[PDB]
Short mmCIF file of C-alpha atoms and ligand atoms in Angstrom, two decimals:
data_model
loop_
_atom_site.label_atom_id
_atom_site.label_comp_id
_atom_site.label_asym_id
_atom_site.label_seq_id
_atom_site.Cartn_x
_atom_site.Cartn_y
_atom_site.Cartn_z
CA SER F 1 20.34 5.54 26.78
CA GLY F 2 23.29 7.41 28.33
CA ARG F 3 24.66 10.82 27.28
CA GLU F 4 27.01 9.71 24.46
CA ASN F 5 24.56 7.31 22.82
CA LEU F 6 21.70 9.84 23.09
CA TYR F 7 23.94 12.49 21.49
CA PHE F 8 24.81 10.14 18.62
CA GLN F 9 21.09 9.35 18.14
CA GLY F 10 21.11 12.63 16.24
CA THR F 11 18.33 14.93 15.19
CA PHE F 12 15.34 12.59 15.55
CA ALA F 13 15.79 12.11 19.33
CA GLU F 14 16.39 15.83 19.74
CA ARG F 15 13.22 16.77 17.80
CA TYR F 16 10.81 13.96 18.72
CA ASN F 17 9.68 11.96 21.73
CA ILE F 18 8.37 8.39 21.33
CA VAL F 19 4.92 8.01 22.95
CA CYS F 20 4.26 4.31 22.15
CA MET F 21 4.80 1.44 19.72
CA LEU F 22 2.07 1.08 17.03
CA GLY F 23 3.18 -2.16 15.35
CA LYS F 24 5.45 -3.73 12.76
CA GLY F 25 5.02 -2.26 9.27
CA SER F 26 6.80 -3.26 6.08
CA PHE F 27 10.49 -2.37 6.36
CA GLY F 28 10.40 -1.39 10.03
CA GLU F 29 8.66 -0.63 13.31
CA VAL F 30 6.09 2.15 13.46
CA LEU F 31 5.76 4.30 16.56
CA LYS F 32 3.63 7.27 17.59
CA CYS F 33 5.87 10.25 18.33
CA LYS F 34 5.45 13.86 19.31
CA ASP F 35 7.28 16.92 18.05
CA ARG F 36 8.80 18.16 21.31
CA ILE F 37 8.42 21.87 20.48
CA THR F 38 4.90 21.81 19.02
CA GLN F 39 3.52 18.74 20.87
CA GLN F 40 1.83 17.58 17.61
CA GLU F 41 1.73 13.84 17.11
CA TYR F 42 3.01 11.91 14.11
CA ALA F 43 3.77 8.39 12.98
CA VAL F 44 7.46 7.45 12.59
CA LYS F 45 8.80 4.43 10.76
CA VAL F 46 12.17 3.29 12.03
CA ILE F 47 14.13 1.40 9.35
CA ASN F 48 17.43 -0.37 10.00
CA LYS F 49 20.09 1.00 7.59
CA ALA F 50 21.06 -2.64 6.83
CA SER F 51 17.60 -2.84 5.12
CA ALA F 52 18.48 -0.18 2.50
CA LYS F 53 18.48 -1.58 -1.02
CA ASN F 54 20.69 1.24 -2.19
CA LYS F 55 24.12 1.55 -0.64
CA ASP F 56 24.26 5.31 -1.39
CA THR F 57 22.32 6.97 1.45
CA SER F 58 22.08 10.22 -0.53
CA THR F 59 19.88 8.49 -3.14
CA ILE F 60 17.50 7.31 -0.45
CA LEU F 61 17.28 10.87 0.94
CA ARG F 62 16.66 12.25 -2.56
CA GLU F 63 13.93 9.70 -3.26
CA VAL F 64 12.15 10.47 -0.04
CA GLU F 65 12.56 14.25 -0.58
CA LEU F 66 10.74 13.84 -3.92
CA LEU F 67 7.95 11.94 -2.15
CA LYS F 68 7.60 14.71 0.49
CA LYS F 69 6.76 17.23 -2.23
CA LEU F 70 3.81 15.19 -3.48
CA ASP F 71 0.29 15.80 -2.25
CA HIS F 72 -2.92 13.79 -2.80
CA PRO F 73 -5.78 13.06 -0.34
CA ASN F 74 -5.40 9.27 -0.70
CA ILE F 75 -1.59 9.18 -0.32
CA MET F 76 0.00 9.37 3.14
CA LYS F 77 1.85 12.74 3.62
CA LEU F 78 5.49 12.52 4.69
CA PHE F 79 7.11 15.31 6.64
CA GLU F 80 10.73 14.26 7.36
CA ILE F 81 13.44 11.66 6.84
CA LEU F 82 16.14 11.73 9.51
CA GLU F 83 19.01 9.35 10.35
CA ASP F 84 21.40 8.12 12.95
CA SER F 85 24.19 5.56 12.55
CA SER F 86 21.82 2.58 12.72
CA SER F 87 18.50 3.77 11.31
CA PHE F 88 16.35 5.95 9.06
CA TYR F 89 13.39 7.70 10.72
CA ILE F 90 10.54 8.56 8.36
CA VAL F 91 8.00 10.89 9.98
CA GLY F 92 4.53 11.42 8.55
CA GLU F 93 0.82 11.72 9.22
CA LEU F 94 -0.62 9.61 12.03
CA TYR F 95 -3.83 7.59 11.31
CA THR F 96 -6.10 5.74 13.74
CA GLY F 97 -8.54 3.69 11.61
CA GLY F 98 -6.39 0.59 11.11
CA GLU F 99 -5.84 -1.11 7.80
CA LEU F 100 -8.14 -2.25 4.99
CA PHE F 101 -7.50 -5.97 5.82
CA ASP F 102 -8.85 -5.37 9.34
CA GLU F 103 -11.97 -4.04 7.62
CA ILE F 104 -12.13 -7.08 5.29
CA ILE F 105 -11.98 -9.40 8.34
CA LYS F 106 -14.82 -7.39 9.94
CA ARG F 107 -17.24 -6.96 6.98
CA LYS F 108 -16.25 -10.13 5.00
CA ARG F 109 -17.66 -8.80 1.71
CA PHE F 110 -18.54 -5.32 0.46
CA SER F 111 -21.54 -4.34 -1.66
CA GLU F 112 -20.72 -3.01 -5.12
CA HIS F 113 -21.55 0.50 -3.88
CA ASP F 114 -19.23 0.31 -0.88
CA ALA F 115 -16.42 -1.41 -2.83
CA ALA F 116 -16.60 1.26 -5.55
CA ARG F 117 -16.26 4.04 -2.90
CA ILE F 118 -13.13 2.43 -1.49
CA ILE F 119 -11.48 1.37 -4.72
CA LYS F 120 -12.11 4.69 -6.51
CA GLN F 121 -9.96 6.36 -3.81
CA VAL F 122 -7.20 3.75 -4.43
CA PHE F 123 -7.49 4.41 -8.16
CA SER F 124 -7.25 8.18 -7.61
CA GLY F 125 -4.07 7.78 -5.52
CA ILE F 126 -2.47 5.38 -7.99
CA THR F 127 -3.25 7.58 -10.98
CA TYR F 128 -1.65 10.55 -9.26
CA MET F 129 1.53 8.70 -8.30
CA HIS F 130 1.87 7.14 -11.77
CA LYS F 131 1.75 10.63 -13.30
CA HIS F 132 4.95 11.23 -11.28
CA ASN F 133 6.47 7.88 -12.39
CA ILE F 134 6.24 6.39 -8.92
CA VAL F 135 5.37 2.68 -8.64
CA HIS F 136 4.23 0.97 -5.44
CA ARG F 137 4.89 -2.73 -6.28
CA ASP F 138 3.67 -3.72 -2.81
CA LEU F 139 0.08 -2.54 -2.86
CA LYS F 140 -1.99 -4.74 -0.53
CA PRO F 141 -4.79 -4.16 1.99
CA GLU F 142 -2.19 -3.78 4.83
CA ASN F 143 -0.77 -0.72 2.97
CA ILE F 144 -4.19 0.95 2.68
CA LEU F 145 -5.00 2.64 6.00
CA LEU F 146 -8.19 4.23 7.25
CA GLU F 147 -7.55 7.83 8.26
CA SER F 148 -9.74 7.53 11.42
CA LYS F 149 -12.36 5.37 13.18
CA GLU F 150 -15.17 7.66 11.80
CA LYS F 151 -17.70 6.10 9.43
CA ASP F 152 -16.71 6.36 5.73
CA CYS F 153 -13.35 8.12 6.40
CA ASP F 154 -10.82 8.59 3.60
CA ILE F 155 -8.36 5.79 2.89
CA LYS F 156 -4.63 6.47 2.69
CA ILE F 157 -2.14 4.39 0.73
CA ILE F 158 1.09 4.04 2.71
CA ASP F 159 4.67 3.21 1.60
CA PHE F 160 3.99 4.31 -2.03
CA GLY F 161 7.45 4.68 -3.59
CA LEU F 162 9.48 3.19 -0.71
CA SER F 163 10.08 -0.26 -2.42
CA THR F 164 12.92 1.24 -4.56
CA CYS F 165 14.70 2.08 -1.29
CA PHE F 166 14.05 -0.67 1.31
CA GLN F 167 13.98 -4.45 1.52
CA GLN F 168 11.35 -6.26 3.58
CA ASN F 169 11.82 -7.26 7.23
CA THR F 170 14.03 -10.33 7.82
CA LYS F 171 11.18 -11.58 10.03
CA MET F 172 7.95 -10.49 8.27
CA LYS F 173 4.64 -10.52 10.15
CA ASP F 174 2.63 -12.11 7.28
CA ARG F 175 4.85 -13.35 4.36
CA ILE F 176 2.24 -15.67 2.81
CA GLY F 177 -0.23 -12.79 2.91
CA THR F 178 1.96 -10.83 0.44
CA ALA F 179 1.83 -13.43 -2.35
CA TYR F 180 -1.85 -12.82 -3.01
CA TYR F 181 -1.32 -9.33 -4.54
CA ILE F 182 1.97 -9.49 -6.41
CA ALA F 183 1.83 -9.09 -10.20
CA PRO F 184 3.24 -11.94 -12.27
CA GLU F 185 5.81 -9.73 -14.02
CA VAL F 186 7.07 -8.52 -10.59
CA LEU F 187 7.81 -12.17 -9.71
CA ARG F 188 9.78 -12.32 -13.00
CA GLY F 189 11.90 -9.25 -12.05
CA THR F 190 10.57 -6.95 -14.78
CA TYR F 191 8.01 -4.36 -13.53
CA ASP F 192 6.56 -1.01 -14.46
CA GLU F 193 3.52 0.98 -13.17
CA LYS F 194 1.01 -1.68 -14.45
CA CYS F 195 1.87 -3.92 -11.52
CA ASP F 196 -0.15 -1.54 -9.28
CA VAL F 197 -3.23 -2.00 -11.48
CA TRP F 198 -2.94 -5.79 -11.04
CA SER F 199 -2.59 -5.46 -7.25
CA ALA F 200 -5.62 -3.16 -7.13
CA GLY F 201 -7.57 -5.72 -9.22
CA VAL F 202 -6.79 -8.43 -6.71
CA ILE F 203 -7.97 -6.17 -3.90
CA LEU F 204 -11.23 -5.40 -5.74
CA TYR F 205 -11.83 -9.11 -6.38
CA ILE F 206 -11.46 -9.74 -2.65
CA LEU F 207 -13.71 -6.78 -1.66
CA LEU F 208 -16.55 -8.13 -3.81
CA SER F 209 -16.20 -11.89 -3.25
CA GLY F 210 -14.51 -12.25 0.12
CA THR F 211 -11.95 -14.66 -1.43
CA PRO F 212 -8.62 -14.25 -3.26
CA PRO F 213 -8.40 -14.92 -7.04
CA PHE F 214 -5.04 -16.69 -6.64
CA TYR F 215 -5.25 -18.95 -3.60
CA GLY F 216 -3.44 -21.80 -1.85
CA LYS F 217 -2.32 -23.34 1.48
CA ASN F 218 1.17 -21.83 1.36
CA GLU F 219 3.28 -19.23 -0.41
CA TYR F 220 4.47 -21.61 -3.16
CA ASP F 221 0.95 -22.75 -4.08
CA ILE F 222 -0.30 -19.14 -4.27
CA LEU F 223 2.63 -17.97 -6.37
CA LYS F 224 2.23 -20.93 -8.80
CA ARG F 225 -1.31 -19.68 -9.49
CA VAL F 226 -0.23 -16.06 -9.86
CA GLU F 227 2.50 -17.08 -12.29
CA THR F 228 0.00 -18.76 -14.65
CA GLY F 229 -2.41 -15.85 -14.27
CA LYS F 230 -5.51 -18.16 -14.45
CA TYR F 231 -8.50 -17.26 -12.24
CA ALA F 232 -12.29 -17.48 -12.46
CA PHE F 233 -15.55 -15.89 -11.38
CA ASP F 234 -17.12 -19.35 -10.92
CA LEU F 235 -17.90 -19.13 -7.18
CA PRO F 236 -21.54 -18.68 -6.16
CA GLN F 237 -20.18 -15.47 -4.64
CA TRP F 238 -19.95 -14.05 -8.22
CA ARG F 239 -23.42 -15.21 -9.24
CA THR F 240 -25.16 -11.83 -8.79
CA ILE F 241 -22.18 -9.46 -9.21
CA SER F 242 -22.64 -7.08 -12.14
CA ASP F 243 -21.09 -7.77 -15.54
CA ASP F 244 -19.54 -4.30 -15.32
CA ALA F 245 -17.62 -5.17 -12.13
CA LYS F 246 -16.37 -8.39 -13.71
CA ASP F 247 -15.34 -6.47 -16.83
CA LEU F 248 -13.20 -4.03 -14.82
CA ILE F 249 -11.59 -6.85 -12.89
CA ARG F 250 -10.83 -8.79 -16.14
CA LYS F 251 -9.10 -5.68 -17.53
CA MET F 252 -7.06 -5.16 -14.36
CA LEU F 253 -6.03 -8.86 -14.11
CA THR F 254 -4.87 -8.99 -17.69
CA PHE F 255 -1.75 -11.18 -17.73
CA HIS F 256 0.58 -9.21 -20.06
CA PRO F 257 1.07 -5.74 -18.59
CA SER F 258 1.26 -4.04 -22.02
CA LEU F 259 -2.38 -5.23 -22.57
CA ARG F 260 -3.57 -4.29 -19.06
CA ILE F 261 -5.60 -1.13 -18.46
CA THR F 262 -4.03 2.02 -16.97
CA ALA F 263 -5.03 3.47 -13.59
CA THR F 264 -6.62 6.46 -15.38
CA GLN F 265 -8.75 4.02 -17.47
CA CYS F 266 -9.83 2.27 -14.21
CA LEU F 267 -11.24 5.62 -12.95
CA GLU F 268 -13.13 6.10 -16.22
CA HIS F 269 -14.62 2.61 -16.24
CA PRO F 270 -18.47 2.49 -16.37
CA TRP F 271 -18.62 0.56 -13.04
CA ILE F 272 -16.84 3.38 -11.19
CA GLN F 273 -18.93 6.04 -12.94
CA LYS F 274 -22.18 4.31 -11.90
CA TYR F 275 -21.28 4.95 -8.23
CA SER F 276 -19.59 8.38 -8.48
CA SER F 277 -21.30 11.51 -7.07
CA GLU F 278 -22.31 14.67 -8.97
C1 VGG S 301 6.60 5.83 5.76
C2 VGG S 301 5.68 5.67 7.01
C3 VGG S 301 6.02 6.28 8.21
C4 VGG S 301 5.20 6.13 9.34
C5 VGG S 301 4.04 5.37 9.24
C6 VGG S 301 3.71 4.74 8.03
C7 VGG S 301 2.48 3.90 7.83
C8 VGG S 301 1.74 3.45 9.10
N1 VGG S 301 1.77 2.17 9.51
N2 VGG S 301 1.07 2.05 10.54
C9 VGG S 301 0.85 0.73 11.24
C10 VGG S 301 -0.62 0.40 11.02
C11 VGG S 301 1.13 0.78 12.72
C12 VGG S 301 1.76 -0.33 10.59
C13 VGG S 301 0.51 3.21 10.92
N3 VGG S 301 -0.30 3.60 11.95
C14 VGG S 301 -0.67 4.86 12.03
N4 VGG S 301 -0.30 5.79 11.17
C15 VGG S 301 0.51 5.47 10.13
N5 VGG S 301 0.86 6.43 9.27
C16 VGG S 301 0.94 4.17 10.00
C17 VGG S 301 4.55 4.91 6.92
#
């Protein structure tokens, strides 16, 4: 506050009013804001500039400008990236349905029909972004948002492409929770687009069984399992799950990424086709 500081807060404070805090997201705090002129509401992520991975701010702006030009119904739309001396402000579509993990906590397990509806949308988004050589790396249920509270609303993947630009919060809200979804080759420091197929496979495993494939009491124990890549469908929870579902998951959780299916192949898989409309 104060005239000088408000002036130096730059174009974001001029253009937008903060209505309320919405919660801590990866990389930064998310707030609901309003465009002062139009009164339309948006979500804004406020990211400390100390959290930039790239020391050249112009590269961050370029990256985000490329992401603004993209358009797919299962990818969050971005409208603006603004700055002041301390922070980046990324403004985009506001959602009100909460995240996919909230929905996992609520429902516990999803029928094959319901899981296929959700995961097909994830696959569609991933396929689209991969066609533009964008990798998520951090795909997890917390980065899959429900557009609204309406029944069967569209899901929206958030933060897709921002991991090249920003490092995680110093204080993260659920660090152990991130280990479940990370691809083994990402842990090794050598990733390409296939890591998003792995993460989506972990999500699908959880939707169907209610349990993670790589588990443990702490981050270390979970990551030790991920690193070996060994998992099973031995739980009674898998007893009556279709062979087709298990086949898709096996292909997605293939250890070597060169041998792992593509996102496009996931969409074509018989299990997804069984539940698609026409
Ligand atoms: C890059 C960016 C900017 C603003 C918001 C997000 C994701 C997001 N995150 N969150 C949380 C759920 C508050 C973390 C949102 N709530 C409502 N609408 C949203 N779009 C979000 C991502």
